[PDB]
Amino acid sequence: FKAGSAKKGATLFKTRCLQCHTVEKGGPHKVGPNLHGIFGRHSGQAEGYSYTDANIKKNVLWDENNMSEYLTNPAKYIPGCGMAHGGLKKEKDRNDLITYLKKASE
Amino acid sequence: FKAGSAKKGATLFKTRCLQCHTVEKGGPHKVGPNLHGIFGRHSGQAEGYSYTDANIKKNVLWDENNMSEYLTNPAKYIPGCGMAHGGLKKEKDRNDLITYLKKASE
Ligand code: HEM
Ligand code: HEM
């Protein structure tokens, strides 16, 4: 991961992520947990959300690289429903996204 | 709606609902909102959850009858993902479920 465009990352997040996740402090859970302070904690630890994926639940320490990898696969499992478009296949898109996400969060 | 078996309703909820919803007080959100005090408020009002369905968001006053109807359709939309098994087709199953849910909640 190498910093990119926050501005474009914002538009990736609004159009690809926001329909399941919010990022502002104290923001609400949706199908996905609120992501505020995601880069200061581990996986599967948002207050007031209960997780499903075994790997998330192991509490991975989130960093840029781990997250890029998490977002690489275009499809993700949504509990009780099936697979959904939960990632960004283009490495540049990931870098943009994560650059925005680091700022919007914390 | 006519009261049924709480015991069987519990097993319907554990096996058909729990994978997206919790019911205890202060319990966490998952893909679905925590359902505690659902029969004392309106639709689309759980603290700390943000909703998608337009109809939910209109804030329907929840009662037994409205809920039975909500659960009738076997498939429900899960935002960003698709349709999922979000209901109970058998009217007796609904009555059992709702009888448990009234108690577990509040
Ligand atoms: C590129 C867009 C997206 C981003 C950046 C994103 C980010 C994340 C992150 C970082 C987590 C981990 C939360 C944690 O460990 O605390 C996560 C979990 C989750 N996200 Fe996303 N997400 C995206 C798209 C989606 C979409 C489209 C959906 C639904 C259709 C979704 C639903 C979920 C769900 C349900 C979880 C919890 C998984 C589980 O408990 O097993 N996300 N998301
Ligand atoms: C018979 C089993 C189930 C029951 C009793 C149940 C109950 C409910 C209730 C009462 C609501 C309305 C919440 C509110 O207005 O505050 C709701 C919303 C929801 N439930 Fe379920 N549910 C069931 C199964 C499912 C399943 C299987 C899933 C996912 C695969 C699910 C996901 C959701 C979601 C995402 C919402 C929020 C809908 C939106 O915002 O558009 N539920 N559920």
Tab-separated table of C-alpha atoms and ligand atoms in Angstrom:
chain	number	residue	atom	x	y	z
A	1	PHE	CA	0.000	0.000	0.000
A	2	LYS	CA	1.189	3.510	-1.044
A	3	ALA	CA	-0.975	6.550	-0.353
A	4	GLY	CA	-3.326	7.628	-3.156
A	5	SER	CA	-6.247	9.948	-3.597
A	6	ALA	CA	-8.497	10.531	-0.562
A	7	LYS	CA	-10.985	12.315	-2.860
A	8	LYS	CA	-11.421	9.371	-5.204
A	9	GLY	CA	-11.321	6.999	-2.200
A	10	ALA	CA	-14.286	8.813	-0.765
A	11	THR	CA	-16.272	8.143	-4.008
A	12	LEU	CA	-15.265	4.486	-3.992
A	13	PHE	CA	-16.522	4.258	-0.376
A	14	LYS	CA	-19.792	6.194	-1.002
A	15	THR	CA	-20.587	4.018	-4.083
A	16	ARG	CA	-19.205	0.614	-3.098
A	17	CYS	CA	-19.200	0.407	0.739
A	18	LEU	CA	-21.601	2.904	2.283
A	19	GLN	CA	-24.633	0.833	1.545
A	20	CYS	CA	-23.377	-1.508	4.375
A	21	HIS	CA	-20.996	0.639	6.452
A	22	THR	CA	-20.772	4.083	8.003
A	23	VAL	CA	-17.446	5.674	9.123
A	24	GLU	CA	-18.140	8.641	11.414
A	25	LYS	CA	-17.646	8.501	15.113
A	26	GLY	CA	-20.520	6.946	17.003
A	27	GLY	CA	-22.145	6.220	13.630
A	28	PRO	CA	-24.739	3.430	13.329
A	29	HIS	CA	-24.322	-0.272	12.337
A	30	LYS	CA	-26.029	-1.385	9.168
A	31	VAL	CA	-25.686	-4.802	7.483
A	32	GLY	CA	-21.911	-4.112	8.226
A	33	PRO	CA	-20.341	-2.577	11.327
A	34	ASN	CA	-19.535	1.110	11.626
A	35	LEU	CA	-15.850	1.499	10.670
A	36	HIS	CA	-14.672	4.410	12.871
A	37	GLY	CA	-11.245	3.760	14.458
A	38	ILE	CA	-10.920	0.546	12.407
A	39	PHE	CA	-7.075	1.118	12.028
A	40	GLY	CA	-6.604	1.407	15.809
A	41	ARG	CA	-8.151	-1.936	16.772
A	42	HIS	CA	-8.511	-5.531	15.638
A	43	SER	CA	-11.070	-7.304	13.510
A	44	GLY	CA	-14.406	-8.312	15.034
A	45	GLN	CA	-14.359	-5.727	17.806
A	46	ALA	CA	-16.897	-2.918	16.903
A	47	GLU	CA	-18.972	-2.042	19.937
A	48	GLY	CA	-22.524	-3.275	19.576
A	49	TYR	CA	-21.973	-5.582	16.587
A	50	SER	CA	-21.817	-9.369	16.485
A	51	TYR	CA	-19.760	-11.046	13.842
A	52	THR	CA	-19.898	-14.158	11.840
A	53	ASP	CA	-16.654	-14.858	9.911
A	54	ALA	CA	-14.301	-17.082	11.837
A	55	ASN	CA	-11.222	-15.194	10.627
A	56	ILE	CA	-12.595	-11.741	11.567
A	57	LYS	CA	-13.443	-13.238	14.946
A	58	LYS	CA	-9.826	-14.272	15.544
A	59	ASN	CA	-9.153	-10.501	15.902
A	60	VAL	CA	-6.624	-9.660	13.180
A	61	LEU	CA	-4.693	-6.402	13.897
A	62	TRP	CA	-5.835	-4.098	11.042
A	63	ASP	CA	-3.162	-2.301	8.969
A	64	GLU	CA	-3.028	-1.071	5.402
A	65	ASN	CA	-1.624	-4.268	3.943
A	66	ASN	CA	-4.006	-6.659	5.759
A	67	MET	CA	-6.964	-4.446	4.657
A	68	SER	CA	-5.815	-4.285	1.004
A	69	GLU	CA	-5.736	-8.093	1.032
A	70	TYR	CA	-9.158	-8.230	2.781
A	71	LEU	CA	-10.581	-5.984	-0.003
A	72	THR	CA	-8.909	-7.833	-2.899
A	73	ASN	CA	-11.539	-10.521	-3.344
A	74	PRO	CA	-14.555	-8.891	-5.109
A	75	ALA	CA	-17.060	-11.199	-3.369
A	76	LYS	CA	-17.622	-11.375	0.382
A	77	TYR	CA	-20.047	-13.492	2.501
A	78	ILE	CA	-23.045	-11.674	4.045
A	79	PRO	CA	-24.414	-13.863	6.802
A	80	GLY	CA	-27.672	-15.685	6.090
A	81	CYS	CA	-27.828	-14.223	2.599
A	82	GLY	CA	-24.890	-15.121	0.297
A	83	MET	CA	-22.064	-13.524	-1.553
A	84	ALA	CA	-21.893	-9.827	-2.199
A	85	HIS	CA	-19.588	-7.269	-3.953
A	86	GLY	CA	-17.489	-6.513	-0.826
A	87	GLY	CA	-14.171	-5.607	-2.392
A	88	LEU	CA	-12.123	-3.748	-4.938
A	89	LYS	CA	-10.251	-5.753	-7.528
A	90	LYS	CA	-7.996	-2.939	-8.806
A	91	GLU	CA	-4.996	-2.408	-6.546
A	92	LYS	CA	-5.067	1.353	-7.257
A	93	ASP	CA	-8.744	1.458	-6.129
A	94	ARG	CA	-7.814	-0.198	-2.861
A	95	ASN	CA	-5.000	2.332	-2.248
A	96	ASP	CA	-7.416	5.232	-2.896
A	97	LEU	CA	-10.059	3.655	-0.667
A	98	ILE	CA	-7.743	2.939	2.203
A	99	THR	CA	-6.206	6.411	1.987
A	100	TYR	CA	-9.769	7.892	2.478
A	101	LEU	CA	-10.685	5.341	5.110
A	102	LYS	CA	-7.618	6.115	7.257
A	103	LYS	CA	-8.729	9.757	7.376
A	104	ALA	CA	-12.514	9.345	7.698
A	105	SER	CA	-11.840	6.915	10.470
A	106	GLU	CA	-10.047	8.527	13.418
B	1	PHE	CA	-52.565	-13.987	15.756
B	2	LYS	CA	-53.507	-16.289	18.695
B	3	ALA	CA	-50.914	-17.225	21.303
B	4	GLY	CA	-49.006	-20.472	20.704
B	5	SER	CA	-45.964	-22.203	22.069
B	6	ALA	CA	-43.145	-19.996	23.410
B	7	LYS	CA	-40.929	-23.110	23.622
B	8	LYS	CA	-41.275	-23.998	19.956
B	9	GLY	CA	-41.100	-20.278	19.066
B	10	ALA	CA	-37.732	-20.116	20.730
B	11	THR	CA	-36.464	-22.965	18.453
B	12	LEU	CA	-37.870	-21.266	15.368
B	13	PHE	CA	-36.008	-18.075	16.399
B	14	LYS	CA	-32.705	-19.847	17.281
B	15	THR	CA	-32.746	-21.767	13.939
B	16	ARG	CA	-34.311	-19.264	11.541
B	17	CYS	CA	-33.639	-15.737	12.910
B	18	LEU	CA	-30.722	-15.704	15.334
B	19	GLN	CA	-28.138	-15.831	12.626
B	20	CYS	CA	-29.120	-12.145	11.904
B	21	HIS	CA	-30.814	-10.927	15.104
B	22	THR	CA	-30.348	-10.989	18.859
B	23	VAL	CA	-33.205	-10.280	21.345
B	24	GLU	CA	-31.763	-9.581	24.805
B	25	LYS	CA	-31.586	-6.150	26.268
B	26	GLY	CA	-28.615	-4.124	25.115
B	27	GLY	CA	-27.730	-7.024	22.802
B	28	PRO	CA	-25.578	-6.400	19.705
B	29	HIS	CA	-26.598	-5.652	16.063
B	30	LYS	CA	-25.640	-8.213	13.471
B	31	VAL	CA	-26.682	-8.217	9.790
B	32	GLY	CA	-30.150	-7.408	11.399
B	33	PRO	CA	-30.938	-5.105	14.318
B	34	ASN	CA	-31.241	-6.324	17.888
B	35	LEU	CA	-34.967	-6.917	18.523
B	36	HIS	CA	-35.375	-6.057	22.238
B	37	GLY	CA	-38.506	-3.957	22.925
B	38	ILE	CA	-39.573	-4.379	19.274
B	39	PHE	CA	-43.329	-4.515	20.336
B	40	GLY	CA	-43.064	-1.198	22.212
B	41	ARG	CA	-41.768	0.918	19.325
B	42	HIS	CA	-42.043	1.403	15.579
B	43	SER	CA	-40.140	-0.042	12.661
B	44	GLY	CA	-36.722	1.367	11.766
B	45	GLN	CA	-35.960	2.747	15.213
B	46	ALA	CA	-33.320	0.438	16.900
B	47	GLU	CA	-30.638	2.538	18.534
B	48	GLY	CA	-27.380	2.330	16.634
B	49	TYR	CA	-28.733	0.706	13.458
B	50	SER	CA	-29.346	2.256	10.052
B	51	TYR	CA	-32.032	0.847	7.855
B	52	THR	CA	-32.626	0.373	4.231
B	53	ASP	CA	-36.227	-0.678	3.416
B	54	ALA	CA	-38.431	2.276	2.634
B	55	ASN	CA	-41.438	0.741	4.398
B	56	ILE	CA	-39.524	-0.058	7.621
B	57	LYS	CA	-38.252	3.513	7.493
B	58	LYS	CA	-41.795	4.913	7.470
B	59	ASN	CA	-41.946	3.695	11.117
B	60	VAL	CA	-44.815	1.191	11.230
B	61	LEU	CA	-46.190	0.661	14.792
B	62	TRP	CA	-45.328	-3.018	15.491
B	63	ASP	CA	-48.107	-5.334	16.750
B	64	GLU	CA	-48.746	-9.041	16.431
B	65	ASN	CA	-50.756	-8.813	13.233
B	66	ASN	CA	-48.378	-6.439	11.391
B	67	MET	CA	-45.434	-8.720	12.387
B	68	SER	CA	-47.205	-11.927	11.261
B	69	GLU	CA	-47.720	-10.261	7.875
B	70	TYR	CA	-44.076	-9.033	7.835
B	71	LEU	CA	-42.934	-12.656	8.460
B	72	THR	CA	-45.311	-14.263	5.936
B	73	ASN	CA	-43.137	-13.815	2.868
B	74	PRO	CA	-40.326	-16.448	3.061
B	75	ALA	CA	-37.831	-14.190	1.240
B	76	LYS	CA	-36.618	-10.820	2.500
B	77	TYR	CA	-34.110	-8.297	1.018
B	78	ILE	CA	-30.689	-8.043	2.724
B	79	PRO	CA	-29.104	-4.793	1.630
B	80	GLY	CA	-26.266	-5.030	-0.887
B	81	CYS	CA	-26.581	-8.802	-1.020
B	82	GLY	CA	-29.975	-10.138	-2.219
B	83	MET	CA	-32.886	-12.151	-1.021
B	84	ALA	CA	-32.739	-14.294	2.060
B	85	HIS	CA	-35.013	-16.694	4.063
B	86	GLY	CA	-36.402	-13.972	6.390
B	87	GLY	CA	-39.821	-15.377	7.175
B	88	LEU	CA	-42.070	-18.216	8.182
B	89	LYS	CA	-44.604	-19.459	5.680
B	90	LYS	CA	-46.711	-21.547	8.095
B	91	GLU	CA	-49.164	-19.400	10.034
B	92	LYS	CA	-48.787	-21.658	13.103
B	93	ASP	CA	-44.980	-21.121	12.982
B	94	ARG	CA	-45.483	-17.376	12.992
B	95	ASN	CA	-47.823	-17.583	16.021
B	96	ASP	CA	-45.245	-19.689	17.915
B	97	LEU	CA	-42.441	-17.324	16.922
B	98	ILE	CA	-44.261	-14.176	17.866
B	99	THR	CA	-45.396	-15.679	21.170
B	100	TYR	CA	-41.656	-16.289	22.044
B	101	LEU	CA	-40.578	-12.944	20.657
B	102	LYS	CA	-43.089	-10.996	22.781
B	103	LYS	CA	-41.558	-12.580	25.889
B	104	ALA	CA	-37.852	-12.556	24.959
B	105	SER	CA	-38.287	-8.952	24.027
B	106	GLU	CA	-39.311	-6.793	26.993
C	1	HEM	C1	-15.232	-1.718	-0.586
C	1	HEM	C2	-16.327	-1.641	0.205
C	1	HEM	C3	-16.324	-2.107	1.629
C	1	HEM	C4	-15.451	-1.884	2.670
C	1	HEM	C5	-14.238	-0.987	2.708
C	1	HEM	C6	-15.789	-2.670	3.741
C	1	HEM	C7	-15.053	-2.720	4.936
C	1	HEM	C8	-15.251	-3.649	5.937
C	1	HEM	C9	-14.407	-3.898	7.048
C	1	HEM	C10	-13.083	-3.231	7.353
C	1	HEM	C11	-14.953	-4.893	7.744
C	1	HEM	C12	-14.379	-5.501	9.006
C	1	HEM	C13	-15.063	-4.923	10.207
C	1	HEM	C14	-14.346	-5.300	11.437
C	1	HEM	O1	-13.449	-6.174	11.470
C	1	HEM	O2	-14.660	-4.716	12.479
C	1	HEM	C15	-16.146	-5.308	7.129
C	1	HEM	C16	-17.031	-6.237	7.635
C	1	HEM	C17	-18.291	-6.426	7.003
C	1	HEM	N1	-18.745	-5.796	5.912
C	1	HEM	FE1	-17.807	-4.631	4.724
C	1	HEM	N2	-16.837	-3.356	3.446
C	1	HEM	C18	-17.236	-3.104	2.162
C	1	HEM	C19	-18.337	-3.576	1.473
C	1	HEM	C20	-19.328	-4.336	2.032
C	1	HEM	C21	-20.569	-4.666	1.403
C	1	HEM	C22	-20.952	-4.380	-0.025
C	1	HEM	C23	-21.319	-5.347	2.302
C	1	HEM	C24	-22.681	-5.978	2.144
C	1	HEM	C25	-23.321	-6.238	1.019
C	1	HEM	C26	-20.511	-5.400	3.517
C	1	HEM	C27	-20.880	-6.040	4.649
C	1	HEM	C28	-19.988	-6.334	5.679
C	1	HEM	C29	-20.375	-7.247	6.730
C	1	HEM	C30	-21.664	-8.048	6.964
C	1	HEM	C31	-19.314	-7.299	7.553
C	1	HEM	C32	-19.243	-8.153	8.791
C	1	HEM	C33	-18.737	-9.548	8.343
C	1	HEM	C34	-18.964	-10.664	9.349
C	1	HEM	O3	-19.310	-10.486	10.506
C	1	HEM	O4	-18.775	-11.873	9.015
C	1	HEM	N3	-19.358	-4.731	3.326
C	1	HEM	N4	-16.369	-4.482	6.054
C	2	HEM	C1	-38.002	-15.550	11.196
C	2	HEM	C2	-36.780	-15.002	11.385
C	2	HEM	C3	-36.577	-13.527	11.544
C	2	HEM	C4	-37.213	-12.588	12.325
C	2	HEM	C5	-38.286	-12.797	13.366
C	2	HEM	C6	-36.779	-11.331	11.994
C	2	HEM	C7	-37.284	-10.153	12.567
C	2	HEM	C8	-37.016	-8.880	12.104
C	2	HEM	C9	-37.666	-7.681	12.485
C	2	HEM	C10	-38.825	-7.538	13.449
C	2	HEM	C11	-37.122	-6.694	11.776
C	2	HEM	C12	-37.523	-5.235	11.847
C	2	HEM	C13	-36.569	-4.487	12.727
C	2	HEM	C14	-37.087	-3.140	13.018
C	2	HEM	O1	-38.058	-2.631	12.413
C	2	HEM	O2	-36.523	-2.493	13.906
C	2	HEM	C15	-36.118	-7.206	10.937
C	2	HEM	C16	-35.270	-6.457	10.148
C	2	HEM	C17	-34.178	-7.089	9.492
C	2	HEM	N1	-33.860	-8.389	9.532
C	2	HEM	FE1	-34.858	-9.844	10.266
C	2	HEM	N2	-35.889	-11.422	11.068
C	2	HEM	C18	-35.705	-12.728	10.701
C	2	HEM	C19	-34.811	-13.271	9.797
C	2	HEM	C20	-33.831	-12.560	9.162
C	2	HEM	C21	-32.773	-13.126	8.384
C	2	HEM	C22	-32.627	-14.572	7.993
C	2	HEM	C23	-31.955	-12.117	8.002
C	2	HEM	C24	-30.728	-12.146	7.123
C	2	HEM	C25	-30.339	-13.117	6.318
C	2	HEM	C26	-32.528	-10.910	8.594
C	2	HEM	C27	-32.036	-9.665	8.412
C	2	HEM	C28	-32.752	-8.512	8.729
C	2	HEM	C29	-32.289	-7.225	8.265
C	2	HEM	C30	-31.081	-6.822	7.407
C	2	HEM	C31	-33.180	-6.341	8.746
C	2	HEM	C32	-33.123	-4.858	8.496
C	2	HEM	C33	-33.861	-4.602	7.157
C	2	HEM	C34	-33.586	-3.249	6.523
C	2	HEM	O3	-33.016	-2.329	7.088
C	2	HEM	O4	-33.972	-3.007	5.339
C	2	HEM	N3	-33.611	-11.235	9.326
C	2	HEM	N4	-36.001	-8.549	11.201
